[PDB]
Amino acid sequence: PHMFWTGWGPWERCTAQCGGGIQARRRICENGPDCAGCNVEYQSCNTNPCPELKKTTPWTPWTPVNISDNGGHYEQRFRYTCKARLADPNLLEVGRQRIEMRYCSSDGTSGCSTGTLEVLF
Amino acid sequence: GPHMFWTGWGPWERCTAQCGGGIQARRRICENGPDCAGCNVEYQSCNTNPCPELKKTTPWTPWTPVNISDNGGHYEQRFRYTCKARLADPNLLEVGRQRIEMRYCSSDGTSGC
Ligand SMILES: *[C@H]1O[C@H](CO)[C@@H](O)[C@H](O)[C@@H]1O
Ligand SMILES: *[C@H]1O[C@H](CO)[C@@H](O)[C@H](O)[C@@H]1O
Ligand SMILES: *[C@H]1O[C@H](CO)[C@@H](O)[C@H](O)[C@@H]1O
Ligand SMILES: *[C@H]1O[C@H](CO)[C@@H](O)[C@H](O)[C@@H]1O
């Protein structure tokens, strides 16, 4: 009896979800053990770039943007998005909020420009 | 004829990732073949330790009053955040666009202030 290879099996699972991985398919040498050639073959898979994953920062608190409520006032809040090219959303995180505080007075020096013109009304 | 044999395995080549898991190959050559028994290449995983947390800061939000000042002065505040990702390359981490919402607060309750 001469040695022979079984037919190639299916391509198995890819090592990466995206950004490039490899996968294998296999076969068996019968009546061997030393058939010519190799019992496993590899190819690349999922070579497309990973998608952009997004996470939003918390909103800042609603605060006035005007220092007077003459007939009402406007309020605003802000937020950003954090983005990364990843396969796992657990690897992207929004870090700790930082806050700064200053006091604005009439004859002040903290560098405020908000209600300067209100004195003229 | 001439004796057919495999050269010794070369060294493992460069890992496809520096962290978070990649693959690397090593190779050998069938001499006086070409039908050597076995494989001319092998692959293994490498650099499976987690990538470091790389960080980028958002821009500061605008300085805004804390509340409507009944007295002469008022406090103002602003904020910023950090974006973090486990990566080797900081270019793959980005701070996105700033979103701004605005409402008008008056005597009625039509805007939820
Ligand atoms: C299996 O590998 C190839 C066929 O795919 C040949 O060298 C031979 O048939 C071997 O048994
Ligand atoms: C597997 O590889 C190809 C088929 O994809 C052929 O050379 C043969 O069928 C082998 O078993
Ligand atoms: C090379 O591969 C193995 C040794 O590592 C054997 O099947 C044989 O020596 C071949 O030439
Ligand atoms: C490479 O693989 C092992 C050594 O790592 C042995 O089977 C032989 O030295 C081959 O060339």
The 3-state secondary structure of A23-74, one letter per residue: EEEECCEECCCCCCECCEEEEEECCCCCCEEEEECCCCCCEECCCCCCCCEE
Strands A29-30, A4-5: pairing kind:
antiparallel
The whole-angstrom separation of Cα A83 and Cα A93 is 9
The domains of chain A are located at 4-45, 50-92
Name the strand (E) or helix (H) holding B25: strand B22-27
How far is residue B6 from each of residues A31, B1, B39, B46, measured CA to CA in Å?
Answer: 22, 16, 9, 25
User: For ligand 4, which residues put their CB under 6 angstroms from it?
Assistant: B 8-9, 28
Resolution of the experimental model, in Å, one decimal: 1.6
- Comparing CA positions, the residue from A35, A41, A4 lying closest to residue A22 is A41
Nearest ligand 1 atom to the CA of A27 is 1
Has domain A4-45 been given CATH number 3.30.500.10?
A: no
Torsion of CA A66, A68, A74, A78, to 10 degrees: 40
CA B39 to chain centre: 35
CATH of segment(s) B5-46: 2.20.100.10
The whole-angstrom separation of Cα A86 and Cα A44 is 18
Give nearest CA residue, ligand 1 atom 7: A36
- Does residue A33 have a cis peptide bond before it, meaning omega lies within 30 degrees of 0? yes
Q: What determination technique applies here? A: X-ray
Hey, are the CB atoms on A79 and B99 less than 8 Å from each other? yes
Residues of B in contact with A75 (CB under 8 A): 102-105, 113
Contacts of A26 (CB under 8 A, 6+ apart): A8, A9, A12, A39, A40, A41
- Report residue B51 as tokens: 């990538």
The whole-angstrom separation of Cα A40 and Cα A25 is 6
Q: How far apart are the first and last CA of chain B?
A: 93
Contacts of A53 (CB under 8 A, 6+ apart): A83, A84, A85, A86, A89, A92
- Comparing CA positions, the residue from A36, A20, A26 lying closest to residue B40 is A36
How close A11 comes to chain B (CA, Å)?
A: 16
Hey, are the CB atoms on A98 and B81 less than 8 Å from each other? yes
- Report residue B59 as tokens: 């821009």
How far is residue A92 from each of residues A56, A81, A84, measured CA to CA in Å?
Answer: 11, 11, 7
- Comparing CA positions, the residue from A73, A67, A58 lying closest to residue B102 is A73
Q: Which residues partner with B83 through β-bridges? A: A94, B56
Question: Is A17:A87 a contact under the CB 8 Å cutoff?
Answer: yes
Hey, are the CB atoms on A72 and B39 less than 8 Å from each other? no
Contacts of B63 (CB under 8 A, 6+ apart): A102, A112, A114, B76, B77, B78
How close B71 comes to chain A (CA, Å)?
A: 10
Strands A81-85, B93-95: pairing kind:
antiparallel
Three-state DSSP class for residue B71:
coil
Buried b (16+ CB within 10 A) or exposed e, A86-114: beeeebbbbbeeeeeeeebeeeeeeebeb
